[PDB]
Amino acid sequence: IQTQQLHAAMADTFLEHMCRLDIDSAPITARNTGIICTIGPASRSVETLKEMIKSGMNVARMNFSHGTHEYHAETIKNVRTATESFASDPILYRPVAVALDTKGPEIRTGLIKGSELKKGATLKITLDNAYMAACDENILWLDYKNICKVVEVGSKVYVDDGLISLQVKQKGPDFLVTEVENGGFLGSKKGVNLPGAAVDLPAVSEKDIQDLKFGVDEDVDMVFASFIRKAADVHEVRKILGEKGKNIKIISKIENHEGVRRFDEILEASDGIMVARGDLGIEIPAEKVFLAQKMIIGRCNRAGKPVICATQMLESMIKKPRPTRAEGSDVANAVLDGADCIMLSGETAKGDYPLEAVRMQHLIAREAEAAMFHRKLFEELARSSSHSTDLMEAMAMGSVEASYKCLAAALIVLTESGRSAHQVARYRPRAPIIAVTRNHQTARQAHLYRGIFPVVCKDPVQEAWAEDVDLRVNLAMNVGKAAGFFKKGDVVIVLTGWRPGSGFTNTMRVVPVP
Ligand SMILES: [K+]
Ligand SMILES: [Mn+2]
């Protein structure tokens, strides 16, 4: 009994690869898939924060659909304080990224009276700012001022995670009379969803404009933009960002139909993507969700752009320690699907078991990462890029191939720009990728890329390239051994440059571990 499910990796047919999976075949020490965690009241604390890091958190999310700049910044300080707390040990310091989550076109309910359930009976919506204080079972206030121009008589309306379905029956300039199809206990400040109606709310709102620019000041590494349908919308966020936020990544989250419908354009303009299941679910018929998930992920893999899979990956775990049999198939399959990053929203913010959440995202990810059919995968991926004759593409391809043959312990890529490493992760190797940069943004952002295990060089630049290179290499070397990625006489591929100002890692080597 082999390890890393290698007996399955040998199969000729997919069926045989599945047939060959073994519960008793041990995964490796490293984790390739990233884990994006959404911080909230349950995980804001520096002590809570650090342990979260130590558990496995890579990226820290900041949901701006809720929150004051004051609150967000505190969240930030903290994230970096727990982050830089480990910084005195170079070989065991884990860089952590920070991400902003925008609130694009987002209808949200009003407030309920300080004294709210609904039956298969009638209710009425109001936009007049007077019932906003008192939102009784009989009356509700929407955030959207242009609601009566979008929806028609018979048109359905959803709220509180599509949990409550409202059928439309009547109109008015300042109203809408609606019946309850599927109703229950209506909360306070729940968001509505208008599937099959056109939201005319701007992609980028004053608040979003405000929120974004602030990101620029907080040195956030990437922006998760909500509700993207067009590419022109992607542009707008780039504009709002400007030169200062030149180096920030723009990950478009698909939440609508138009979004799935106009994905190529979006993909191009984007720098990453996010499958925002929580919203799309409401937006498109939920039975259709998996289809849009795989299309998306597959398309992003073929393209070389990082992709995120989120919303309700381990819900149940919010109140309960152990996930469900389906929570676990969801997360495992998502890794198989080939998502470069998984993510927790409820389980790590509101959550009662925050850490226990991260831990299982990590355990499931390791097992699902080896279940992958790396041989077919790379052939299937090589074929697609067959049109490209890039040099790094070539060099990435080689390295991955050669790591399959000699069963490498890891791939060590010395980058700055982080491109070279990006380019190799793209080739879905089966071993960890140790990227070594002196650039911080680069390290922090490298999480977005599957397989990449960033390390950062605090050491000055030395005179001889040869020695600088051997300087960085060594570190990689040292850091793998400690983390335990590889032992004393293991083999490992190294990718560097021949001479400075190389532009790309054009030198490959097969160097045993000292
Ligand atoms: K949001
Ligand atoms: Mn959303």
CA 375 to mean position of chain CA atoms: 25
The ligand placed nearest to the CA atom of residue 281 is 2
- Residue 52, exposed/middle/buried by CB under 10 A (0-12, 13-18, 19+)? buried
Burial 162-173 (b: 16+ CB within 10 A, else e): bebbbbbeeeee
Q: Which residues pair with 101 in a beta bridge?
A: 63, 224
Contacts of 193 (CB under 8 A, 6+ apart): 107, 157, 158, 159, 162, 279, 282, 283
* Whole-angstrom distance, CA of residue 275 vs CA of residue 66: 20
Torsion angle, alpha carbons of 316, 322, 327, 329, to 10: -170
The DSSP 8-state label assigned to residue 178 in this structure reads E
Closest by CA to 494, choosing from 439, 435, 442, is: 435
- Helices 206-218 and 69-83: crossing angle, nearest 10°? 30
- Helices 391-405 and 374-384: crossing angle, nearest 10°? 160
The DSSP 8-state label assigned to residue 460 in this structure reads P
As residues whose CB is below 5 A from the ion ligand 2, the structure lists 279
Indicate which residue of 311, 437, 442, 496 is catalytic: 311
Q: Are 203 and 104 in contact (CB under 8 A)?
A: yes
Q: Are 137 and 123 in contact (CB under 8 A)?
A: yes
* Whole-angstrom distance, CA of residue 39 vs CA of residue 55: 15
The DSSP 8-state label assigned to residue 134 in this structure reads -
Question: What's the one-letter identity of residue 10?
Answer: M
* Whole-angstrom distance, CA of residue 425 vs CA of residue 442: 15
Q: Which residues pair with 335 in a beta bridge?
A: none
The ligand placed nearest to the CA atom of residue 64 is 1
- Sign of the Cα torsion 36, 42, 43, 48 reads negative
Q: Which domains does the chain have, with CATH numbers?
A: 1-30+369-513 (3.40.1380.20), 31-104+203-368 (3.20.20.60), 105-202 (2.40.33.10)
Compute φ and ψ for 135, nearest 5 degrees: -110, 75
Name residue, tokens 């990810």.
365
* Whole-angstrom distance, CA of residue 478 vs CA of residue 514: 9
Q: Are 196 and 168 in contact (CB under 8 A)?
A: no
Q: What is the resolution of this structure in A?
A: 2.9
Q: Which residues pair with 156 in a beta bridge?
A: 167
The DSSP 8-state label assigned to residue 117 in this structure reads B
Task: Name the pairing type of β-strands 156-159 and 164-172.
Answer: antiparallel
Rounded distance from Cα 139 to ligand 1 centre (Å): 26
- DSSP conformation letters of 193-212: E-TTS---S-SS-HHHHHHH
The H or E element spanning position 448 is: none
* Whole-angstrom distance, CA of residue 58 vs CA of residue 77: 16
Provide the terminal-to-terminal Cα distance of the chain, rounded to the nearest Å. 27
* Whole-angstrom distance, CA of residue 114 vs CA of residue 173: 28
Q: Which residues pair with 254 in a beta bridge?
A: 275
Rounded distance from Cα 255 to ligand 2 centre (Å): 6
Secondary structure of residue 361 in the 3-state scheme: helix
Q: Which two tokens stand for residue 178?
A: 């609606």
Closest by CA to 11, choosing from 379, 335, 376, 431, is: 376
The H or E element spanning position 235 is: helix 232-241
Residue ranges of the binding site for K(+): 63, 65, 101-102
* Whole-angstrom distance, CA of residue 239 vs CA of residue 104: 16
**Residue 89 CA: distances (Å) to CA of 196, 458, 485:** 54, 11, 18
The DSSP 8-state label assigned to residue 169 in this structure reads E
Indicate which residue of 61, 156, 430, 444 is catalytic: 61
Contacts of 243 (CB under 8 A, 6+ apart): none
61 noted as active-site residue: yes
Contacts of 94 (CB under 8 A, 6+ apart): 53, 54, 83, 86
Rounded distance from Cα 161 to ligand 2 centre (Å): 10
Closest by CA to 102, choosing from 54, 53, 67, 71, is: 67
- DSSP conformation letters of 277-303: HHHHHHHS-GGGHHHHHHHHHHHHHHH
Name residue, tokens 């140790």.
434
* Whole-angstrom distance, CA of residue 473 vs CA of residue 513: 11
Closest by CA to 52, choosing from 81, 73, 32, is: 81
Contacts of 22 (CB under 8 A, 6+ apart): 1, 2, 5, 7, 8
* Whole-angstrom distance, CA of residue 290 vs CA of residue 266: 19
The H or E element spanning position 170 is: strand 164-172
Contacts of 207 (CB under 8 A, 6+ apart): 103
Q: Which two tokens stand for residue 69?
A: 């700049």
DSSP H helix total and E strand total for the chain: 16, 19
Contacts of 466 (CB under 8 A, 6+ apart): none
Q: Which two tokens stand for residue 237?
A: 């966020």
Secondary structure of residue 393 in the 3-state scheme: helix
The ligand placed nearest to the CA atom of residue 191 is 2
* Whole-angstrom distance, CA of residue 236 vs CA of residue 225: 11
* Whole-angstrom distance, CA of residue 312 vs CA of residue 118: 26
Rounded distance from Cα 225 to ligand 1 centre (Å): 8
Residue 507: HSE in the Cβ half-sphere, 13 Å Cα cutoff: 12
Q: Which two tokens stand for residue 39?
A: 């911080």
* Whole-angstrom distance, CA of residue 312 vs CA of residue 497: 43
* Whole-angstrom distance, CA of residue 225 vs CA of residue 208: 9
The ligand placed nearest to the CA atom of residue 227 is 2
Rounded distance from Cα 67 to ligand 1 centre (Å): 10
Gaps in the chain with C–N over 2.5 Å, residue before each: 115
- Sign of the Cα torsion 343, 344, 348, 349 reads positive
Indicate which residue of 229, 253, 277, 450 is catalytic: 253
Residue ranges of the binding site: 58, 61, 63-66, 94, 101-102, 108, 190, 253, 255, 278-279, 311, 415-420, 447, 465, 472, 499-504
Compute φ and ψ for 60, nearest 5 degrees: -105, 120
Rounded distance from Cα 62 to ligand 2 centre (Å): 13
Closest by CA to 78, choosing from 41, 45, 35, 38, is: 45
Residue ranges of the binding site for ATP: 63-66, 108, 190
Q: Are 267 and 273 in contact (CB under 8 A)?
A: yes
Tell me the H-state helices in 284-353: 289-303, 325-336
Q: Give the angle subtended at the CA of 242 by the CAs of 237 and 246, to the nearest 5°.
A: 100
Q: Which two tokens stand for residue 308?
A: 């995120």
Tell me the H-state helices in 149-231: 206-218
Q: Are 409 and 480 in contact (CB under 8 A)?
A: yes
Rounded distance from Cα 52 to ligand 1 centre (Å): 22
State which approach was used to obtain the coordinates: X-ray
Q: Which two tokens stand for residue 143?
A: 């955030």
Residue ranges of the binding site for substrate: 61, 253, 278-279, 311
Residue ranges of the binding site for L-serine: 58, 94, 447
Indicate which residue of 20, 50, 54, 108 is catalytic: 108
311 noted as active-site residue: yes
Closest by CA to 332, choosing from 307, 364, 303, is: 364
Rounded distance from Cα 105 to ligand 2 centre (Å): 9
Rounded distance from Cα 131 to ligand 2 centre (Å): 25
